[PDB]
From a paper:
Human islet amyloid polypeptide (IAPP) is a 37-residue polypeptide hormone that is co-secreted with insulin from pancreatic β cells and plays an essential role in glycemic regulation. IAPP forms amyloid deposits in the pancreas of >90% of individuals with T2D.43–45 A single genetic mutation resulting in a serine to glycine substitution at residue 20 (IAPP-S20G) is associated with familial, early-onset T2D.46,47 Recently, cryo-EM structures of IAPP amyloid fibrils assembled in vitro for the wild-type (WT)48–50 sequence and IAPP-S20G48 have been determined, as well as those of patient-seeded WT IAPP. Here, we used cryo-EM to determine structures of amyloid fibrils at different times during in vitro fibrillation of a disease-related variant of human islet amyloid polypeptide (IAPP-S20G). Strikingly, the fibrils formed in the lag, growth, and plateau phases have different structures, with new forms appearing and others disappearing as fibrillation proceeds.
Based on these data, we selected three distinct time points to solve the fibril structures present to high resolution using cryo-EM: 3 weeks, representing the late lag phase, 6 weeks, representing the growth phase, and 22 weeks, representing the plateau phase. 2D classification of fibril segments from the cryo-EM images revealed that ~30% of the fibrils in the 3-week dataset display an ~21-nm crossover distance, which was not a major component in the 6- or 22-week datasets, consistent with the analysis of nsEM images. A single solvable fibril form representing ca. one third of all fibrillar IAPP-S20G imaged was present at 3 weeks. These fibrils yielded a 3.0 Å resolution cryo-EM map that contains a 2PF fibril core with a 21 nm crossover distance, into which an atomic model could be built for residues 12–37 of each subunit. Despite these differences, the 3-week IAPP-S20G and WT IAPP fibrils share some similarities: they have a similar crossover length (21 vs. 25 nm), have a conserved inter-subunit interface involving the major aggregation prone region of IAPP (residues 23–27), and share a similar backbone conformation across residues 15–28. The remaining 68% of fibrils at the 3-week time point have no discernible twist, and their structure(s) could not be solved by helical reconstruction. The balance of sub-unit folds underlying the different fibril structures also changes as assembly progresses, with the P-fold found in the earliest fibrils in the lag phase, followed by the L- and C-subunit types in the 6-week sample, with the L- and U-subunit folds dominating at 22-week time point.
Numbering used by the authors:
A (entry chain H), B (entry chain F), C (entry chain D), D (entry chain B), E (entry chain J), F (entry chain A), ...: 12 to 37
Write the structure that this text describes.
Amino acid sequence: LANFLVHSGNNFGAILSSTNVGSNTY
Amino acid sequence: LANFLVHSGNNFGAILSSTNVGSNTY
Amino acid sequence: LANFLVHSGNNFGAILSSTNVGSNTY
Amino acid sequence: LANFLVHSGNNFGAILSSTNVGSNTY
Amino acid sequence: LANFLVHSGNNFGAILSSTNVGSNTY
Amino acid sequence: LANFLVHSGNNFGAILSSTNVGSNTY
Amino acid sequence: LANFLVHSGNNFGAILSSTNVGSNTY
Amino acid sequence: LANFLVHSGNNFGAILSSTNVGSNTY
Amino acid sequence: LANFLVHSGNNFGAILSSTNVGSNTY
Amino acid sequence: LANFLVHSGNNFGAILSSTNVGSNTY
């Protein structure tokens, strides 16, 4: 069906794919 | 069907794809 | 059908694609 | 059918594509 | 069905895939 | 000032109050 | 100031209050 | 200032309050 | 300042308060 | 400042407070 499959009744969480997240604190 | 598949009844979470997120704190 | 597929009954979450998000705090 | 597909019954969330979002706080 | 499958009743946790997360503290 | 207060610079998200949302799929 | 306060620069997410959301799948 | 306070630069997530969410799958 | 305080640069996660979430699978 | 304080640069996780979550599987 798919390479990735998320099946839920209620969903509240984030879903990231091919993302670049970065944090810099000075 | 797809490379990525999200199937839910109620959805409340963010869905990111090929995104660049960045935070800088000074 | 698609490379990405979001199937829901009620949707409330944001859907980002190829987006650049940035925050700077001084 | 498409590269990205969003199928819902009721939709309330934002859908961004190729967008640049930025916030600066002084 | 899929290479990865997440089946739940209520979901609250993040789901990352092919993501690069980084933090730098100075 | 108020029981609920939403203060933003740019707003794009829906704001619901005392609403009844329902979806039925057959 | 308020019982609930949401202060942001850019807002894209939904804000629900005293809402009843329901989904039925057959 | 408030009983609940959400302060961000960019916001993308849903904010629920006194909400009743329900899903039924047959 | 508040009883609950969420301070972030970029926010993507849901924020629930006094909510009742329920899922029934048959 | 607060009874509970969440301070982050980028946030992706759900934040629950005074919530009742329930799942029933038959």
